[PDB]
Amino acid sequence: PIETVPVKLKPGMDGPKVKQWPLTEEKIKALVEICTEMEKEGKISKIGPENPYNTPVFAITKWRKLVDFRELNKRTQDFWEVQLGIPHPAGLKKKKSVTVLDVGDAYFSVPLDEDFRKYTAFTIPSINNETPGIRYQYNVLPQGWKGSPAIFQSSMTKILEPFRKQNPDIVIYQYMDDLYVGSDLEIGQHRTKIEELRQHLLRWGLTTPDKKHQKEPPFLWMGYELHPDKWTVQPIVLPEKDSWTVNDIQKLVGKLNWASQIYPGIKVRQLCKLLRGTKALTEVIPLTEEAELELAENREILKEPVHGVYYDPSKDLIAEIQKQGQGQWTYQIYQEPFKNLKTGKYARMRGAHTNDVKQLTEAVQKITTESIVIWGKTPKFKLPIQKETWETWWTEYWQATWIPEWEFVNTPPLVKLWYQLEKEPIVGAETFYVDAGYVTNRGRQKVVTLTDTTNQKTELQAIYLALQDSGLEVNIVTDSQYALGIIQAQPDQSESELVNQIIEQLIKKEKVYLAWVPAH
């Protein structure tokens, strides 16, 4: 039927010459039957002992022929990656009706590069010992071989190609041995095209199940539950118990996460806290009062089904973003007011310290990136930030950045800049020279020496001290380019406590001028 895909071994390498394991006469028997039916169908063919190559085989009444091609595969060229990523459901279009077609005898319908067959040679032992065994070789795509998946996919799409142009209404997504066919056709006309397809495939030896022997919606797929006009995630059930093991908690969190893409409100902050210090996947962690509350809240949220709507090219994509806790963002992408195509969370803490502006901006990128991936275009953004505030940070920051069309949305908590460094020294404000203590222009000083502290950490401490003892307005002079940079980036949150302490001071001051000067 189809033209063959030329194949070659990896360079330098030669075909496999691996020993055929001993086989029971019952195994020998079952195999000769299976192998004679396959020679009757042409899948394989008998060859003479001139072929020095060989792949091991075995059998696993119920009998089946399993050929071990791992060795050959080690020697077989690399092929173009069989379908890398898979379409997120939020990116599919709404269909009136859809039919999934399972393709049987898939690989058993595509010839094999003649020039390559010899390399797939294998041998089944003859019952009588005096006599030699039978040597065959595949003429089709051998289940288990390296290129089969890719060579098959290729062919398929080459086969669907025509039918497709003759049916511009119908949408077909190919996935492994499945064939998802959808349309906006009336129930009757749909089942007809489907049968058309089924024959267009049969025409090349491709066999699929008929109308009664076909799976019907919703299609549970790759962790989702797909309807023709809507989707959702596979049903999620939060176990009930009083003894949670570290492993238990991890799986719970994992599940909880897979849900955020549709269920808004899911939180894991507290359940994740339970993993601190854990010493074995089988260690038991009692649920804190906050964790119990979280679980309960998620149970409830999960209790009532939610569902994602499909992409409607006609309309615009809107992405809305909110802050739901320090370093915690939530967003949703819709086209029609509140009809969510998809939702999600972002907690990515990029860098040791940041602020809501940098973070928020980083969320736009992720969202933007996945939007282009799922829909091919970027969504208009509705952000809890004012354009003035963004631009303030914009120009200040030494790093370039861009945010597509977006409109401010007055939905607390609005993201802001809790403090800003005066660009010029303050007249009349005391001056603190810091190097682990400090000296002011007003004669004041305090040299403290702390136990257990990094050099980098000793600096911030001094600056900290300085802030603590200073009035509402203060000028600070450090030789630490580090702390300078840190504070200069105007963080509002830090993993370090010191920082946070300092940030507290900054927010409190009326005016702070930070200056750097080389040491020594």
Next chain:
Amino acid sequence: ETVPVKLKPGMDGPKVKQWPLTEEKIKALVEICTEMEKEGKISKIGPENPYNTPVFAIKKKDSTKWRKLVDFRELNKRTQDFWIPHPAGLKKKKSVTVLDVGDAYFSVPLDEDFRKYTAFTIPSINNETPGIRYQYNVLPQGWKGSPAIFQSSMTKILEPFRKQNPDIVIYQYMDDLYVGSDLEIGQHRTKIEELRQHLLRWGLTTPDKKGYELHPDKWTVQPIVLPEKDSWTVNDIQKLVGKLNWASQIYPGIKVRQLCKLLRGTKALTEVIPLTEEAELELAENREILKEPVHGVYYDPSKDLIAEIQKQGQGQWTYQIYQEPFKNLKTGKYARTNDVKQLTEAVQKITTESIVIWGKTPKFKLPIQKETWETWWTEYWQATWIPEWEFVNTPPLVKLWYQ
């Protein structure tokens, strides 16, 4: 008719991940490629071909058509070297116009055993389809081998116009053609257009680009500067001493002893300090030392060209082209649109200058997050080449010492 090109010994073909594209661009590439296929420039390929090079679609400024841009960067680094030396005269021309002689490669076939390596893919939205894959049959635009292999036919196809009016210095870098001269702005665009027809009578319709001209003759370096303050506060001086101290790394002649003295004890920042004859003279010297680039900075062709860029805010940027730290071969600036649009315009601007001056593109160090650059750079980029680049987090210290 094909010339046997190979890869550097032992190297395999590129397998570069294709960055997600927008439906707008993809469609553009579909039309484009469906036509290159129709013309046998490219051909659909099968699964036995595991290679890949990223492809993109950029627009031609003041032109309605889209352009397929292929990131052969990975490939070009793995392609066998080929054994005209860069003209030190071009940089000295009054005006250089840049042309897109890319369509010229479209005739020369590509050695069939090398074709597989030029494989690329047109992604599909949401992976709802496997995505269209092709390879080239003719010399591809952007591939290092193309200009080389076509070196010959070019020399010939240019030999007449070359010696006809040799008062012009023509130069080829990849798909581009840099045409320099000293004609008057009018007499230039004239003989400039003529070359365009002389080439039409040989291969492509060849459109110029950036349609404007460069004026290398006027490219001036940006020396380190110092605040010309009327009165000097303790702060002013500190920023001064500091900047100086940093610039001493490059100019050993610089001194601050007298300036540092003006900063005795624990003085209040805003305290205005009057400058002392001694120091005042020391400053003027330093200032005088900075009036020009540090001596002994020669371009070593065996080394790569690095280009760092900084954001000074206000839509203004500073850059430095060098090979060895503190030994910059050049510096300048760019002014304003948004942050990304500006950076690309700069990168491209700096690369063009680099090509004219050294006939080589530099390795950039961009102050941006990869994912952001990857997302928008193709939005304003219009050059036919793509420099190598990296992503850094510049210290607001070095940014406080330029411009």
